[PDB]
Design a protein around this ligand. Structure first.
Ligand SMILES: [Mg+2]
Ligand SMILES: [Mg+2]
Ligand SMILES: [Mg+2]
Ligand SMILES: [Mg+2]
Ligand SMILES: [Mg+2]
Ligand SMILES: [Mg+2]
Ligand SMILES: [Mg+2]
Ligand SMILES: [Mg+2]
Ligand SMILES: [Mg+2]
Ligand SMILES: [Mg+2]
Lengths: 135, 199, 131, 80, 156, 88
RNA sequence: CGGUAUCUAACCAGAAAGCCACGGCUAACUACGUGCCAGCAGCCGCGGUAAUACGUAGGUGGCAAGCGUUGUCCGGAUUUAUUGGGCGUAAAGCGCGCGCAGGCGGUCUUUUAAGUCUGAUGUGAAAGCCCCCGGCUUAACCGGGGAGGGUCAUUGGAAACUG
RNA sequence: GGUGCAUUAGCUAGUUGGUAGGGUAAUGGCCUACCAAGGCAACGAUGCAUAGCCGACCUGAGAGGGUGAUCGGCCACACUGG
């Protein structure tokens, strides 16, 4: 566009969007409003657990969960590691990171921070899955 | 020192004669590990300019975090960016101890200084990172002058570099003039280092 | 010459350069005069002649080629366009092709190439690049 | 002594009593593309005798505040 | 007295009436450090024999580059195909700053300091074409003086 | 009520002061009218530098120095001079 | 603060290393267990009984009192393109005219100096980035000196180009 | 001189100017009585939403883009309103 056609209306860039929208909200219990902050993790409580089937072409069975966050939003998260000890209505710590296979789930539970215990028998790559040093 | 591991793997994996010549690559020059004695794979250019970055800091055995800081400090110095960083990194008093022969190796010189065995201009200095400038004096503090190791390490005395002056009668030394790259080891290129950090 | 008779003038040189022509003529003006004389001072033009006419006269320009069929004027670019005028301060007059090229400046003391405008410490509108 | 700022401009209206509004149209390099854009803001002056007429060119000077907005006084009617 | 270096090896295939048949195409660039460089293409059924056929092509497209003060004289842009690359001189000792297959021609040519940037497409066959086009517009100081009837001092 | 005073700069347990003029109401190291000189108490023969001309015109304008600053000028030999212009 | 900094003298290698990764991007490979299960995943995608991609073990690579994961911002992104993009077929020329405001405007001469360029004066605090020296056993840090930073103001000049 | 929204087009009635007087440290519709009907806005008035401002900090080759914590200057507030 010519310069004059560029001074009547300027160039406005795009607006890139967040990929983890439930980790950048906040609830003010006094006024009942959704604050706009940022936060690496949020605490939540479980509503229902279980398993889901992966999308094509993968054909395993994956352990998922549905959690109600501190800001009152209910979403679905993924349980990593080999097995879990997650009963219904337990406090968990959630974090970002999607999984390609399962369609709906976007968040990703931390292992070892809360009710979720450390994965059993991890000899390497142990900083994740939260298991102490086998002294 | 700072890396307290076996002294030969790093020298031969690196494809050079680290810390002198031929002591560690004399026999079984295959690269370390279960493999390495099998075959060599053509190194991608990223490997070319990374391993040769390793051929510098591994030569002096200093942790990386200050390899930047010396490199960054060397950038402000006028001249050629790659060459000066080699020059400045040669001014550490470990070399100035190792070059004079007061220590058999480099890592011994670091262990020598850290226990405060030397004094620059007659004052004790405790750290290997001090850089010495032209016209300074390096003595041995006249405390452990009769220790067997130091006199023994002066017996080899392969070839004292031109750009330093020394005598064992009074155990003194100095830096006559700024070295000139060629006077260094300079067996490695310097351009493949500057490229790596200008990524 | 609808809007810019200097932008047109540069183009008329470049078009006839591409096809390896030798002579070209075009209507004359006071500003077109010395801009055609400057190019003679650096050999970019073999020579220039003026013609008197009834309306305003024309100017005939003899374009120059080096032997072995190599062109001499390899391009032209305009900077002060009528839609967007540009002015350059004394210290910020650029050098074209690290001094191999030439730029034209209409300083306060007549049209001048920046070889001496920087030497005379003046600035003004920047007319064109030649390289 | 120190002098107040003195401007020029063109008369725009006189429907207000004993005061006139004059525009001062000047150029200004744009923010980013560097294109001169006609920028014009209009002040309010003072006329003791209402001599100045619409469409005239004058020179006005800053002064003490005199009304809610009136803070310039006329110096001379440059032309009609 | 040249120092050929390989750039990319593809694996192309054409479909026949019974199935598919594969062949290998390799791009190599050849030069000596003086300033003479060239590039060539090849195609064969076996990769070791694809490279050898490629070099003999490249030895026919030698080109020269001006190297005043161990650096290109002035900035220039090469604009072949969908790939555009600009080259501009660097300060002494900086080193060659270039993409993947555009430093390859520069290292072989024998230039020590130069900057660059590949503003066009990223197909390696078109980067080498653009760069070779880039250097044609690159002139020594005296050649310009010969054409314009001047000498060196007034130009610089 | 402009008073000559000091201004604490430097690392902990290594003070380095400035001879600076200021209004009495403003903070210790906040706004200041004009800097005069430094004063280093680390070295045994103290390091003192002052304008010795600008302060003279300030004192004729009504600045009363601080207790320790008053000692610095005397040991500097410049308080005696101010005793010699007031007779004029 | 505080018998804090520091110095001196005696004793013992003894009391002091972990985290991530190893198919490509990307530096770094084998054996066993499992067999579209358990599982990994930043993208390509790995697993259906001979896995350099799952789990463990040996070895190697990276970095180091730290190493990884998540979150926010800039870059690569010429992916809002003034410097620095386009519209036949890839998204992109309104269905087409008459036209207000606006934007731009053939050749020459004289004049004005709003734009334009330039000289001087004042001012743009201190700390901060940069540069030059000096102090902390070195560095971090801390000092002194300068430079820059304005579509800044007053005043004097130039008249080629725009008005 | 420095923010978005036009899926936000008109706003203002002490308003805009004038004659006297009142009130303050001071000029002033700051206020009063009277006179006239003006003043602002597509060069974004009005309304809505968001936000303390700057020296500076992070990034970038540069132009630019994001932020205004600690340190310094200016402003506003002190449980909410007068
Ligand atoms: Mg450290
Ligand atoms: Mg006056
Ligand atoms: Mg594995
Ligand atoms: Mg961009
Ligand atoms: Mg179609
Ligand atoms: Mg289409
Ligand atoms: Mg049409
Ligand atoms: Mg300052
Ligand atoms: Mg607020
Ligand atoms: Mg960029």
């Amino acid at each position: 566009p010519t310069i004059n056609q560029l001074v009547r209306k300027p160039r406005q860039s795009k607006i890139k969007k967040s990929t983890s929208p439930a980790l950048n909200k906040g609830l003010n219990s006094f006024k009942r409003e959704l604050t706009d902050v940022n936060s690496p993790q949020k605490r939540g409580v479980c509503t229902r657990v279980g398993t889901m089937t992966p999308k094509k072409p993968n054909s395993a069975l994956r352990k998922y969960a549905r959690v109600r966050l501190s800001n009152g939003i209910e979403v679905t998260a993924y349980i990593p590691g080999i097995g879990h000890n997650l009963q219904e209505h337990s406090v968990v710590l959630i974090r970002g990171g999607r999984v390609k296979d399962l369609p709906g789930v976007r968040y990703h539970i931390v292992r070892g921070a809360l009710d979720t215990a450390g994965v059993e028998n991890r000899g390497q790559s142990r900083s994740k899955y939260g298991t102490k040093k086998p002294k | 020192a700072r890396y307290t591991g076996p002294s030969w793997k790093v020298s031969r994996r690196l494809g050079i004669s680290l810390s002198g010549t031929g002591k560690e690559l004399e026999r079984r020059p295959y690269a370390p590990g279960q493999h390495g004695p099998t075959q060599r794979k053509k190194i991608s250019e990223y490997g070319l300019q990374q391993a040769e970055k390793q051929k510098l800091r591994h030569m002096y055995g200093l942790t990386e975090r200050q390899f930047k800081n010396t490199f960054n400090k060397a950038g402000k110095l006028q001249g050629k960016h790659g060459e000066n960083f080699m020059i400045l990194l040669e001014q550490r008093l470990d070399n100035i101890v190792y070059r004079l022969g007061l220590a058999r190796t480099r890592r011994a010189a670091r262990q020598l200084v850290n226990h405060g065995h030397i004094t620059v201009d007659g004052k004790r200095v405790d750290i290997p990172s001090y850089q010495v400038s032209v016209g300074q004096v390096i003595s041995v503090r006249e405390k452990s002058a009769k220790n067997s190791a130091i006199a023994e390490s002066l017996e080899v005395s392969s070839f004292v570099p031109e750009y330093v002056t020394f005598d064992a009668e009074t155990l003194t030394g100095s830096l006559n003039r700024l070295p000139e790259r060629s006077e260094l080891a300079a067996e490695i290129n310097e351009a493949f280092i500057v490229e790596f950090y200008s990524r | 010459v609808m809007t810019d008779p200097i932008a047109d003038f540069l183009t008329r040189i470049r078009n006839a350069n591409m096809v390896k022509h030798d002579k070209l003529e075009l209507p004359a003006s006071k500003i077109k005069k010395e801009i055609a004389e400057i190019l003679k001072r650096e050999g970019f033009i073999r020579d220039v002649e003026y013609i008197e006419d009834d309306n305003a006269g024309t100017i005939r320009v003899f374009l120059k080629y080096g032997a072995t069929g190599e062109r001499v004027i390899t391009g032209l670019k305009r900077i002060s366009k009528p839609g967007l005028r540009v002015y350059a301060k004394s210290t910020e007059v650029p050098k074209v092709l690290n001094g191999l090229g030439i730029a034209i400046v209409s300083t306060s003391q007549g049209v001048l190439t920046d070889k001496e405008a920087r030497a005379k410490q003046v600035g003004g509108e920047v007319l064109a690049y030649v390289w | 002594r120190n002098q107040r700022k003195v401007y020029t401009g063109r008369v725009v209206s006189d429907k207000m009593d004993k005061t006139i509004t004059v525009v001062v149209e000047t150029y200004k390099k744009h923010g980013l593309y560097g294109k001169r854009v006609k920028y014009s803001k209009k002040f309010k002056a003072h006329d003791e005798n209402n001599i100045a007429k619409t469409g005239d060119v004058v020179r006005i000077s800053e002064t003490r505040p005199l009304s809610a907005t009136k803070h310039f006084r006329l110096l001379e009617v440059v032309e009609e | 007295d040249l120092e050929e270096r390989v750039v990319t090896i593809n694996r192309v295939a054409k479909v026949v009436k019974g199935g598919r048949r594969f062949r290998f195409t390799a791009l190599v660039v050849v030069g000596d450090k003086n300033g003479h460089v060239g590039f060539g293409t090849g195609k064969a059924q076996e990769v070791p024999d694809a490279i050898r056929k490629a070099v003999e092509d490249a030895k026919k497209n030698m080109v020269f580059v001006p190297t005043v003060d161990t650096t290109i004289p002035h900035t220039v842009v090469g604009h072949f195909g969908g790939g555009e690359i600009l080259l501009k001189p660097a300060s002494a000792g900086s080193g060659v700053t270039a993409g993947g297959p555009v430093r390859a021609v520069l290292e072989l040519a024998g230039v020590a300091d130069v900057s660059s940037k590949s503003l066009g497409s990223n197909t390696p066959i078109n980067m080498v074409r653009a760069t070779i086009d880039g250097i044609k517009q690159l002139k020594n100081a005296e050649d310009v003086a010969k054409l314009r009837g001047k000498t060196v001092e007034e130009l610089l | 009520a402009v008073k000559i005073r000091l201004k604490r700069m430097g690392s902990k347990k290594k003070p380095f002061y400035r001879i600076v003029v200021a209004d009495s109401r403003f903070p210790r190291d906040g706004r200041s009218i004009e800097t005069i000189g430094t004063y280093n108490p680390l070295l045994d023969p103290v390091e003192v530098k002052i304008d010795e001309e600008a302060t003279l015109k300030w004192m004729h304008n009504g600045a009363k120095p601080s207790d320790t600053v008053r000692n610095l000028l005397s040991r500097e030999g410049i308080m005696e001079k101010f005793h010699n212009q007031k007779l004029g």
